[PDB]
Each structure stands twice: as C-alpha cells, then as structure tokens.
UniProtKB/Swiss-Prot annotation:
Quaternary organization: Monomer.
Protein name stated in the entry: Lysozyme C
Tissue-specificity statement: In the egg white and polymorphonuclear leukocytes.
Broadest EC class assigned to this enzyme: hydrolase
Amino acid sequence: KVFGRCELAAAMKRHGLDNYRGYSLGNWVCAAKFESNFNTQATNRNTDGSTDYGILQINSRWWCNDGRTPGSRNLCNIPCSALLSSDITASVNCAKKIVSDGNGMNAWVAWRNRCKGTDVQAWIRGCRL
Ligand code: NA
C-alpha cells in the first residue's frame, strides 16, 4: 500500500506514536517519507547481506527474520515479510522496540540526515488528527 501523508499520520497516531519516547508524530511521518516513500512494500538490500523492509525500512540483521541473514537476530520476533503488510501494526510495534534501544530515532539513517532538526510539524500540517 502506498499511504497518503495524512492517512499515515492518522494511522501512526492510532497505534500510539505521537510522542512515543518523546518523538512527536511529524518525526515519524518524516522518517517514513524518506525511508520508504510511504509504501509498505519497500525492500532494500544492504552490503552486509541484510535487507531493509517496509514503511520504516527495518533491518533483518537485528529485528526480523528473512531466512537469509546469517547469524542475525530476530529481536521483534516476526518474519520480515510481516513488515510489508498494508496494516502497519507490526511495523509500528517493532519500531517502538527499536526507538527504545538507546539511540532513539538516530537508528533511522534517513531521519538523522533529513528530518532531525528540521520543522517536522510540517509533515502533519493540514491533517485532521
Ligand atoms: Na534476522
């Protein structure tokens, strides 16, 4: 599924991300825009042999199992293909574990480089929330 911008704010909000670990909803829409272009089905391979899956581009070296990432962990206890669903539930619940882990949202490269320190409220402007 390719979300609309307000459609995904609204959904993120329903699954408890506005202000999760102190990260306001715009930070998240912004991360999802630059990671996945808003598309639950986005996959990207990495040089280490890992792959990034779904709307938030969560990595198979630590968080999900894809069966082809040797010696990797599955810290969210789900196959990686669960992260490509039109229902962003599993992506959200795994994202809450990742943002808890010590480095906050800096774990999303593209958040760090494209969203951090910017006016991220602009990602939810106009939306009926
Ligand atoms: Na894994």
